[PDB]
Design a protein around this ligand. Structure first.
Ligand SMILES: CCCCCCCCCCCCCCCCCC(=O)OC[C@H](CO[C@@H]1O[C@H](CO[C@H]2O[C@H](CO)[C@H](O)[C@H](O)[C@H]2O)[C@H](O)[C@H](O)[C@H]1O)OC(=O)CCCCCCCCCCCCCCCCC
Ligand code: CLA
Ligand code: CLA
Ligand code: CLA
Ligand SMILES: CCCCCCCCCCCCCCCCCC(=O)OC[C@H](CO[C@@H]1O[C@H](CO)[C@H](O)[C@H](O)[C@H]1O)OC(=O)CCCCCCCCCCCCCCCCC
Ligand SMILES: CCCCCCCCCCCCCCCCCC(=O)OC[C@H](CO[C@@H]1O[C@H](CO)[C@H](O)[C@H](O)[C@H]1O)OC(=O)CCCCCCCCCCCCCCCCC
Ligand SMILES: CCCCCCCCCCCCCCCCCC(=O)OC[C@H](CO[C@@H]1O[C@H](CO)[C@H](O)[C@H](O)[C@H]1O)OC(=O)CCCCCCCCCCCCCCCCC
Ligand SMILES: CCCCCCCCCCCCCCCC(=O)OC[C@H](COP(=O)(O)OC[C@@H](O)CO)OC(=O)CCCCCCCCCCCCCCC
Ligand SMILES: CCCCCCCCCCCCCCCC(=O)OC[C@H](COP(=O)(O)OC[C@@H](O)CO)OC(=O)CCCCCCCCCCCCCCC
Ligand SMILES: CC1=C(/C=C/C(C)=C/C=C/C(C)=C/C=C/C=C(C)/C=C/C=C(C)/C=C/C2=C(C)CCCC2(C)C)C(C)(C)CCC1
Ligand SMILES: CC1=C(/C=C/C(C)=C\C=C\C(C)=C\C=C/C=C(C)\C=C\C=C(C)\C=C\C2=C(C)CCCC2(C)C)C(C)(C)CCC1
Ligand code: OEX
Ligand SMILES: [Cl-]
Ligand SMILES: [Cl-]
Ligand SMILES: [Fe+2]
Lengths: 342, 81, 336, 38, 108, 37, 448
């Protein structure tokens, strides 16, 4: 006698092998298409007419160099639907126009929403706190700023990161040469977050494993544990005294330690996301003007910053001709900045 | 612990029926993938150039899409063999 | 009880009642790390410019010489020195020692001994406290990475000038030149290193969020949840079964660690193994075993080379190669 | 009918060999044909 | 507490595999047992808090429980009739598959 | 004592939603290894 | 075998179940020995089969044949391979010997005695028996000394060793006057590892190489007899952990050092690793480039001594910070490189200007030209040249493979010391399985 919502809710939230839930209605369709779009694009779809490159296994690329490349810059920020004014219903021409990138980017962005809603959905059902969903906001902020916000501030989707291994590497090296992204204080906070989180993961895992209580007679200490055991498996007091005498400071609160393990990585990605938002507008921390004034006036003042500035000039000049074919940059070799010999 | 009502994978992957059924289904999907490429259908469906189709007598350089609302017409001319 | 001087000294050295444990590795760690710390702080603030490339073109790296915190650095030893030992007593004057990049070798040599002794000091305290001795093994991963960029890479390249500068902007110059000469991004070991830190960052966030999500209610809402834990508790402060239930439904039941001991070993192994390989990657690239080179790998039927994303990377690599050390190369090949 | 079960370790072994064979073919194709620079 | 008899491991053919999947070792429970490295046990088994909780993590959540397997999976229902048809179908499809691969290729 | 399980379930669709296309794609990529420029 | 039920070690630590099973542990070590001899034989035959005489050894990815060539097998003057039959019998002899070694490994592992202490007291041992452990150490120390004497017998009585510094060109040479002076030997051992010194990697004569192996052969034999007739003293008994895993960790730390040294030997040394077979070193190739351009620019007409670079330093010739005349450019770092093709142009004060512009032999130019193009630079997929190069040349130097691999092995076996030595102390102390819940040591300490 239950209504549609109740009868459907019963089926969606059934405790099966792979939980579906209400958010699965949004996650699984979009996530499958984003996965399928990437695998299809890296296997058969070319980037010959968008970037002048081969980016599929069928064209001869391998896992490292295959990618689902962005549309041509002339497309601007066109959403590039299968039915849009570009590639009007023609599937094969849609693939040749780079429309598969916006397909993966859009259905992929809604999959991230669906997965984060899934974390809320399951946590409410299991009756626990929603801190895993809050932790997942950081990867979403990275995806939203890097794959959506940054190209939207630039000329078009062409400058978004293409979905591939080497394509991401080109995107990375583009940011050094054109944005000096290493010098940005927001990637610096992002690096500290990621490196700090990797440190915490390793240091906490090792500390627990080396302060374990003897709860068995076997050398294999993995078996001497029960998920329902009330006693702690490792000595926090020994762990605390160890790091107090080795490092000078140690965690004394188990709850604080695990929250810190969550705060460092999330805060890092969020800070890094702010910096990429700034690069979307070319609002970059490219240079220190005081040193540039000093260097120009004094031809003997050199720092590692000025050396990097010259490296960026080399990256921009030797990469623009092929990385930006829409600009039609024909640079004669004499005009390219080149050092002695080499 | 417990189980969610599905048959244990170990049971299915050890049963004779599964291998009798998947000794044809999995091989057939592989062969279909092989024929999808060998018959040239992969090139035609997704439009990737054949190894002898990247350049033409008219165009000896990389293509460039320089139009948005006429991109469908333009990419046909660039892809013309 | 002990009456002998050495018997009393050895008891004090290995005493676990010291605020900071000293131990026998500490009689090596403390003097070396203090020596490196002292010269580093002094050099980072007031060191004169250093002729890093051996071409009589000094590079300023000190705060009092026009750098800020980001651009300040301890410049590596001169290329004229090479791998030759350059202690302060092998220089005619302390001005000459500063000019040739002496402080870099003093820091790097004492610092390498410090981290090796810091690693042993971690083992020693564990033995004195009666715990399992493998925190030092997990610390070998960052030690290997530090040893690779300060010792092994200069060793293979033939000069301490190719070590990582002790500065922020100096680090970036190290990475950019490293990409241009070795294509480190295409090397499978930096790939494993990236998976080590991206995965380690992921696992830290997941483990931290899963434990925080499962905290057993022991406080009110006007107090920090941390207050629910008392240092020295014999009972568990969060429900492991509840956290496993959540993550079990999140992907599927058998993708989750039901065992806290297995989970924490995985939390330690994944980043440590990843950093071990990226440390090896720099060490292997020290002997010029570069990353994958897929330039002009795709050619059409008539032989025309079809570019890929790897070729676009080569274009960026080309730009850095022809600009790093502009005045240092007299001959076309960068064999050094 | 025919009573019996395929041993799990045999399933893993044959599947493991097939995966290794598939990877080997991919590495073989890395040196020949398209994408081989030849 | 947990009952090991209702964990689905009761039909393991090998006793050692049955004990390993149960997280139990009668050998290690004896106080005269000696490690391969020469260390004598302290009287605990694989897990000291077992009995208090009923079992270790191995017995708490096994991943290989043949008791819960379907009995219909122990045998192929079609029997020799199906296998012969399966064997014949394999040969026919193998020949067609090879011919299709050969025909649709630049070979020869 | 006796266990009878359903053959087709949500898990079945998930396994085949990913396995079927993968085996096809694996067959296609294997065919590409023998294509000559 | 055993199981986790009766041992407490899982399958992934399964070989730890052999710690006190001396008989099975013997078969384990003999079987791995058969694998080592098998690989040496199989890889030798693989390299002989894939050997084409139109290329040098270092251009064919051979790492075992150069080791045979340095011993003076099938090589004529100038590092030219004349016959590969000696390389063939080396591979066959190892391959066949691995079969009997493999049989003993399989026999002593599967069906031989589990413990030798009862039936064979001579071979039986318990790790705690320091006396018995030293005898085994002493015995295997003698066979190592005898193995070292084989090298000097080869270099002095059986054909000889390939000398790359031999007068008249590199050739197989009988060593008649090995350098056994204590000052020379101790000079190499306690030399600095830094530039110019290079510790023992800087040995530059076959007289010093086989002079050292005379010392090593003699010391190991005397040390073998010493460690057989004596038991460890009190100072040693209170300094080392006397457990089977502890002895393993000592060896792991030792061969970690040996792994690193082999990495630096293959990378810098040109005597024990002649460039004729292993290719140019890193310093050699960089030194060969400036030598090549010095020679070709002289013919075009230019005073190389007076030529300035953009920086004002000598474009071709400059002075090292110690005063020696050296090649200019970035290769100023490699000024301590010494090679057979370059020493004839070097006088007491450094490179001789007169000889550089009057008496450069064609063979010296050809050597430097060849070494420059085969510089030890390459990619993971063996693409020769710098990272910014096209897929044209399929070459990675054997020095790159030898140095890169044996550094990774050297580092991982250092982690072996850290792991197996930490566990050895904890297990002996008795807390390798965890902290006693009722007897936690920290709980009995004053708070900080
Ligand atoms: C303390 C912090 C510093 C640590 C050591 C730094 C110096 C190591 C080094 O620059 O070199 C290590 C030395 C090799 O030194 C090199 O030794 C060479 C020897 O070749 C010389 O002699 C050769 C003989 O044929 C050739 O003639 C060659 O042309 C000629 O140059 C050169 O002298 C180089 O200048 C010299 O740097 O080897 C060795 O000591 C082997 C032992 C060290 C292994 C590598 C270190 C691993 C450490 C942690 C992991
Ligand atoms: C829940 C699953 C889901 C979701 C969220 C999306 C979402 C999206 N898809 Mg996708 N898609 C899906 C499933 C899904 N898809 C499936 C199952 C398939 C078949 C395999 C596809 C195949 C597909 C293709 C081929 C394409 C997309 C595209 C898109 C993007 C824009 C298309 C769009 O929404 O325009 C339309 C907007 C709406 C329909 C708003 C809906 C609001 C409701 C339904 C209105 C109710 C209508 C009703 C008659 C009332 C009348 C109102 C009156 C005023 C007229 C978008 C982000 C395009 C793309 O990738 O961009 C590059 C594209 O080309 N999808
Ligand atoms: C160099 C590698 C090596 C060697 C020499 C050994 C040797 C040994 N292992 Mg071990 N092991 C290894 C690697 C190795 N292992 C690795 C990598 C792992 C992780 C998977 C393990 C995990 C492991 C476990 C869990 C155990 C052992 C055990 C043993 C011992 C007895 C094995 C036995 O009797 O079972 C019998 C094995 C068989 C019947 C099958 C092998 C049949 C032969 C030997 C195969 C080789 C055929 C060969 C080509 C024939 C040519 C020889 C000649 C005719 C030319 C034995 C001395 C057991 C032990 O500790 O003893 C108490 C045991 O518990 N190992
Ligand atoms: C390479 C194999 C080898 C191994 C594993 C050992 C192992 C051992 N030796 Mg031995 N020894 C060896 C070769 C070896 N030796 C050789 C070839 C000789 C002849 C030179 C000796 C001569 C020798 C003597 C005279 C003594 C030992 C002693 C010892 C024991 C003390 C270890 C110690 O504290 O040394 C650690 C090293 C140092 C403390 C300083 C090393 C400084 C060297 C000489 C130069 C600097 C480098 C130990 C079990 C002692 C013993 O217990 O007597 C039975 C003892 O007094 N050995
Ligand atoms: C929340 C949102 C959830 C839903 C999201 C969208 C769902 C589905 C979207 C697809 C349905 C079609 C939408 C557009 C409808 C429309 O107006 O038509 C738009 C056009 C109309 O038709 C075109 O119109 C043009 C403008 O007038 C021109 O006239 C063209 O000549 C004409 O073809 O046709 C389409 O684009 C529909 C294409 C349907 C393709 C389905 C997917 C194909 C997938 C794989 C095919 C593989 C291989 C095929 C090739 C070989
Ligand atoms: C799974 C986990 C990850 C696994 C990783 C390792 C996977 C495979 C490793 C083995 C295969 C290595 C391929 C080498 C390719 C190569 O360059 O040489 C292979 C070379 C490539 O070289 C080319 O050779 C051609 C023919 O002469 C050309 O004419 C040229 O000579 C040359 O360009 O060609 C061959 O010699 C053919 C050998 C084909 C090898 C296929 C192996 C398939 C797998 C076998 C193992 C199965 C089961 C093992 C079970 C245990
Ligand atoms: C017993 C008591 C003392 C044993 C001798 C101690 C060492 C002698 C003094 C140091 C010395 O200068 O030796 C000088 C001797 C003589 O040998 C000369 O040494 C010079 C400096 O070492 C140079 O190396 C010369 O090349 C060498 O000819 O060589 C040694 O250094 C050997 C010392 C190590 C062996 C000592 C005996 C064991
Ligand atoms: C013997 C050689 C010593 C090696 C040097 C060790 C350095 C010690 C550095 C610790 C000082 C940081 C104080 C944290 C503040 C503090 O003391 O909090 C103390 C805190 C203890 O927290 P509790 O567990 O007591 O928390 C209970 C709740 O009340 C929490 O609020 O310890 C930690 O949080 C562990 C994190 C330590 C890791 C610190 C991060 C790294 C330091 C970064 C330094 C920046 C670089 C400066 C260069 C210019
Ligand atoms: C957004 C959320 C994403 C949903 C997840 C993706 C949906 C598709 C996944 C469905 C198929 C998953 C297949 C692996 C799931 C699977 O088949 O596991 C099966 C296996 C245990 O399952 P059984 O079928 O044996 O279950 C019998 C039970 O009664 C005894 O516990 O799991 C394990 O092997 C232990 C942990 C291994 C963890 C790795 C899993 C793979 C095992 C082999 C390696
Ligand atoms: C204990 C055990 C183990 C191991 C084992 C082993 C490691 C074994 C080895 C074995 C071996 C190590 C074997 C070997 C063999 C060899 C042989 C059998 C030989 C052969 C040869 C021939 C047959 C001939 C050849 C020839 C010549 C003469 C000339 C040229 C040509 C040719 C090549 C043909 C395992 C892991 C399983 C586990 C379980 C237990
Ligand atoms: C052959 C040859 C040579 C050489 C020779 C020789 C003679 C060698 C030797 C060597 C020796 C003769 C020695 C070495 C080394 C040793 C070591 C490296 C170690 C030590 C160790 C340790 C381990 C210590 C420890 C300690 C003690 C005291 C006890 C306990 C505590 C401790 C741990 C702290 C040459 C060069 C001519 C070149 C050519 C070839
Ligand atoms: O020093 Mn520092 O960066 Ca190793 O590459 Mn050659 O050298 Mn110089 O150039 Mn590139
Ligand atoms: Cl630079
Ligand atoms: Cl140069
Ligand atoms: Fe934890």
């Amino acid at each position: 006698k239950r209504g549609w919502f109740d009868v459907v809710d019963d089926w969606l939230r059934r405790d099966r092998f792979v939980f579906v839930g209400w958010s699965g209605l949004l996650l699984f369709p979009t996530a499958y298409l984003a996965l399928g779009g990437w695998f299809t694009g890296t296997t058969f779809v070319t980037s010959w007419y968008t970037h002048g490159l081969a980016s599929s296994y069928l064209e001869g690329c391998n896992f490292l160099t295959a990618a689902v490349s962005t549309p041509a810059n002339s497309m601007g920020h066109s959403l590039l639907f299968l039915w849009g004014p570009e590639a009007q219903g023609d599937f094969t021409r849609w693939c040749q126009l780079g429309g598969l990138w916006t397909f993966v980017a859009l259905h992929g962005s809604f999959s991230l929403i669906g997965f984060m809603l899934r974390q809320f959905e399951i946590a409410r059902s299991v009756k626990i706190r929603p801190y895993n969903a809050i932790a997942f906001s950081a990867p979403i902020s990275v995806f939203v700023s890097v794959f959506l916000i940054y190209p939207l501030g630039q000329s078009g989707w062409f400058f978004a990161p293409s979905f591939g291994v080497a394509a991401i590497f080109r995107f990375i090296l583009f940011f050094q040469g054109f944005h000096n992204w290493t010098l940005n204080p927001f990637h610096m906070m992002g690096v500290a977050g990621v490196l700090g989180a990797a440190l915490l993961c390793a240091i906490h895992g090792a500390t627990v494993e080396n302060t374990l209580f003897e709860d068995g007679d076997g050398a294999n200490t993995f078996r001497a544990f029960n998920p329902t055991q009330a006693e702690e498996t490792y000595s926090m007091v020994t762990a605390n005294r160890f790091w107090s005498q080795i490092f000078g400071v140690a965690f004394s609160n188990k709850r604080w330690l695990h929250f810190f393990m969550l705060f460092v990585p999330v805060t890092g990605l969020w800070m890094s996301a702010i910096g990429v938002v700034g690069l979307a507008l070319n609002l970059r921390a490219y240079d220190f003007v005081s040193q540039e004034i000093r260097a120009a006036e004094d031809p003997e003042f050199e720092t590692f910053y000025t050396k990097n500035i010259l490296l960026n000039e080399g990256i921009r000049a030797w990469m623009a001709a092929q990385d930006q074919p829409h600009e039609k940059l024909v640079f004669p070799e004499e005009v390219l900045p080149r050092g002695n010999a080499l | 612990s417990g189980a969610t009502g599905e048959r244990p994978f170990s049971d299915i992957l050890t049963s004779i029926r599964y291998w009798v059924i998947h000794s044809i289904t999995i091989p057939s999907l592989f062969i279909a993938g092989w024929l999808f490429v060998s018959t040239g259908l992969a090139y035609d469906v997704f439009g990737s150039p054949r190894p002898n189709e990247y350049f033409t007598e008219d165009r000896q350089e990389t293509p460039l899409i320089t139009d948005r609302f006429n991109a469908l017409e333009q990419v046909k001319k660039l892809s013309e063999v | 009880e002990s009456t002998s001087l050495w018997a009393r000294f050895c008891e004090w050295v290995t005493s676990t009642e010291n605020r900071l444990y000293i131990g026998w590795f500490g009689v090596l760690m403390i003097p070396t790390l203090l020596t490196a710390t002292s010269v580093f702080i002094i050099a980072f603030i007031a060191a004169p410019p250093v002729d890093i490339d051996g071409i009589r073109e000094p590079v300023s790296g000190s705060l009092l010489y026009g750098n800020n915190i980001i651009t300040g650095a301890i410049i590596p030893t001169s290329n004229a020195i090479g791998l030759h030992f350059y202690p302060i007593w092998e220089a005619a004057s302390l001005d000459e020692w500063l000019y040739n990049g002496g402080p870099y070798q003093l820091i790097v040599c004492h610092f390498f001994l410090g981290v090796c002794s810091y690693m042993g000091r971690e083992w020693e305290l564990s033995f004195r406290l009666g715990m399992r001795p493998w925190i030092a093994v997990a610390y070998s991963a960052p030690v290997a990475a530090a040893t690779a960029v300060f010792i092994i890479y200069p060793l293979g390249q033939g000069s301490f000038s190719d070590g990582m500068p002790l500065g922020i902007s100096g680090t970036f110059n190290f990475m950019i030149v490293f990409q241009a000469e070795h294509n480190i991004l295409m090397h499978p070991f930096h790939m494993l290193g990236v998976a080590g830190v991206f995965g380690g960052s992921l696992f830290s966030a997941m483990h931290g969020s899963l434990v925080t999500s499962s905290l057993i209610r022991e406080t009110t809402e006007n107090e920090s949840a941390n207050e629910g834990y008392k240092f020295g508790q014999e009972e568990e402060t969060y429900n492991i079964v509840a956290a496993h239930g959540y993550f079990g439904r999140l992907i599927f039941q058998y993708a989750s660690f039901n065992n806290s001991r297995s989970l924490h070993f995985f939390l330690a192994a994944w980043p440590v193994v990843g950093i071990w390989f990226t440390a090896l990657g720099i060490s292997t690239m020290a002997f010029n075993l570069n990353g994958f080179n897929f330039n002009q790998s795709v050619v059409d039927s008539q032989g025309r080379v079809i570019n890929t994303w790897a070729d676009i990377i080569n274009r960026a690599n080309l730009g850095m190669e022809v600009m790093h050390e502009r005045n240092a190369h007299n001959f076309p090949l960068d064999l050094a | 009918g025919t009573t019996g079960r395929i041993p799990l370790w045999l399933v893993g072994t044959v599947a493991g060999v097939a995966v290794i064979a598939l990877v080997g073919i991919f590495f073989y194709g890395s040196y020949v044909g398209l994408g081989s620079s030849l | 507490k947990i009952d090991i008899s209702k964990q689905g491991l009761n039909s393991i053919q090998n006793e050692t595999v049955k004990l390993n999947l149960m997280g139990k070792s009668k050998t290690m429970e004896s106080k005269d047992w000696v490690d391969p490295q020469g260390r004598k046990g302290k009287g605990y088994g694989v897990y000291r808090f077992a009995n208090k909780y009923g079992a270790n993590v191995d017995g708490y959540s096994p991943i290989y429980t043949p008791d819960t397997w379907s009995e219909s999976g122990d045998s192929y229902k079609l029997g020799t009739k199906g296998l012969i048809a399966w064997a014949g179908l394999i040969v026919v499809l193998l020949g067609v598959g090879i011919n299709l691969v050969i025909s649709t290729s630049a070979l020869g | 004592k006796s266990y009878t399980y359903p053959i087709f379930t949500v898990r079945w669709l998930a396994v085949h939603a990913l396995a079927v296309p993968t085996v096809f794609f694996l067959g296609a990529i294997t065919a590409m290894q023998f294509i000559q420029r | 075998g055993r199981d986790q039920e009766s041992t407490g070690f899982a399958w992934w630590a399964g070989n730890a179940r052999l710690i006190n099973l001396s008989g099975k542990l013997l078969g384990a070590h003999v079987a791995h020995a058969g694998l080592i001899v098998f690989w040496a034989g199989a890889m030798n035959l693989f390299e002989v089969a894939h050997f084409v005489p139109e290329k040098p050894m270092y251009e064919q990815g051979l790492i075992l044949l150069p080791h045979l060539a340095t011993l003076g097998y099938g090589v004529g003057p100038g590092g030219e391979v004349i016959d590969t039959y000696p390389y063939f019998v080396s591979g066959v002899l190892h391959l066949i010997s691995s079969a009997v070694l493999g049989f003993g490994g399989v026999y002593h592992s599967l069906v031989g005695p589990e413990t030798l202490e009862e039936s064979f007291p001579f071979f039986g041992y318990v790790w705690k028996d320091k006396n018995k452990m030293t005898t085994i150490l002493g015995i295997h120390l003698i066979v190592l000394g005898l193995g070292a004497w084989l090298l000097v017998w080869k270099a002095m009585y059986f054909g000889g060793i390939y000398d790359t510094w031999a007068p008249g060109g590199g050739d197989v040479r009988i060593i008649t006057n090995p350098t056994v002076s204590p000052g020379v030997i101790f000079g190499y051992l306690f030399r600095s590892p830094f530039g110019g010194d290079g510790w023992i990697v800087s040995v530059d004569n076959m007289e010093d190489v086989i002079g050292g192996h005379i010392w090593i052969g003699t010391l190991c034999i005397f040390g073998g007899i010493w460690h057989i007739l004596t038991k460890p003293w009190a100072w040693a008994r209170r300094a080392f952990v006397w457990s089977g895993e502890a002895y393993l960790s000592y060896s792991l730390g030792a061969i970690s050092i040996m792994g690193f040294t082999a990495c630096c030997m293959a990378w810098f040394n040109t005597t024990a690793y002649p460039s004729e077979f292993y290719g140019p070193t890193g310093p050699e190739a960089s030194q060969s480039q400036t030598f090549t351009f010095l020679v070709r620019d002289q013919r075009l007409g230019a005073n190389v001594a007076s030529a300035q670079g953009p920086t004002g330093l000598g474009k071709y010739l400059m002075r090292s910070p110690t005063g020696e005349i050296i090649f200019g450019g970035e290769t100023m770092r490699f000024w301590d490189f010494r090679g057979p093709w370059l020493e004839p142009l070097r006088g007491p004060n450094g490179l001789d200007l007169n000889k550089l512009k009057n008496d450069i032999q064609p063979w010296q130019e050809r050597r430097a030209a060849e070494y420059m193009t085969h510089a030890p630079l390459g990619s993971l997929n063996s693409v020769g040249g710098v990272a910014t190069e096209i897929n044209a040349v399929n070459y990675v130097s054997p020095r790159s493979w030898l140095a890169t691999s044996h550094f990774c092995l050297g580092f991982f076996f250092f982690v072996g010391h850290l792991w197996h030595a930490g566990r050895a102390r904890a297990a002996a102390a008795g807390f390798e399985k965890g902290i006693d819940r009722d007897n936690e040591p920290v709980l009995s300490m004053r708070p900080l």
